[PDB]
Design a protein around this nucleic acid. Structure first.
Ligand SMILES: [Fe+3]
Length: 202
DNA sequence: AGGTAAACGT
DNA sequence: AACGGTATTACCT
């Protein structure tokens, strides 16, 4: 059974690419550090985030925003690594989205206990483009629902190297990550990373 | 009009 | 601990 209409999980797709991806995560973070963002309502998110590519997702007092500039550094987000772009393109193609051209990559870091409550990826003006989501390090339970918050959730363990792609009918589906279980991974040690690729501009 | 933030009790 | 209330409003454009 496929994940959902327009959605697929490519298990261990990024396994072979993972070591390089993690080197590049470190490189990106060395320029735009991971930060736990504060919601408009004033709560600090448990996931630490950064971005690369032309547009980075951030919170603001007034809401969520894509910006070409990191509000923390006041500099552009780091360029999207070629390893990221190449893996994203290969995954998108395998998943049936050959023409996807991301301009934004959000990098998420989960420590034990860190979670991401159900939400929609909805800040992008062009909903034709899919989301490509790469998991690295410790395993996590991914919730994938529907268009409405109360729609039944599927729970999928995402393991190191797994890639999930959603788009088309499932583009705006609610999704999230359950509190990360403590553990060890030879490549990330004690955390999970996730790369989320999007086309956030025109 | 419409968009839209949302991360505690049972 | 899985599920669902809350935004059933209060603003901005
Ligand atoms: Fe998301």
């Amino acid at each position: 059974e496929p994940l959902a209409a327009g959605a697929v999980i490519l298990r261990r797709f990024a396994f072979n690419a993972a070591e390089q991806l993690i080197r590049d995560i470190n490189d990106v973070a060395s320029q735009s550090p991971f930060r736990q963002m504060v919601t408009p309502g004033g709560y600090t998110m448990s996931v630490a985030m950064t971005n690369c590519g032309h547009l980075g997702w951030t919170t603001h007092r007034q809401g969520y925003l894509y910006s070409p500039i990191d509000p923390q550094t006041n500099k552009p987000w780091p360029a999207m690594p070629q390893s990221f772009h190449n893996l994203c393109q290969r995954a998108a193609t395998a998943a049936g989205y050959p023409d996807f051209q991301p301009d934004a990559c959000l990098i998420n870091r989960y420590a034990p206990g860190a979670k991401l409550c159900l939400h929609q990826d909805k800040d992008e003006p062009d909903l034709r483009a899919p989301i490509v989501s790469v998991s690295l390090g410790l395993p996590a339970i991914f919730q994938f629902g529907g268009l409405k918050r109360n729609d039944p959730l599927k729970r999928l363990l995402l393991e190191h190297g797994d890639v999930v792609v959603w788009g088309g009918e499932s583009r705006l589906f609610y999704h999230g990550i359950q509190p990360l279980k403590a553990g060890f991974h030879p490549l990330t040690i004690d955390c999970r990373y996730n790369l989320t690729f999007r086309q956030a501009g025109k």
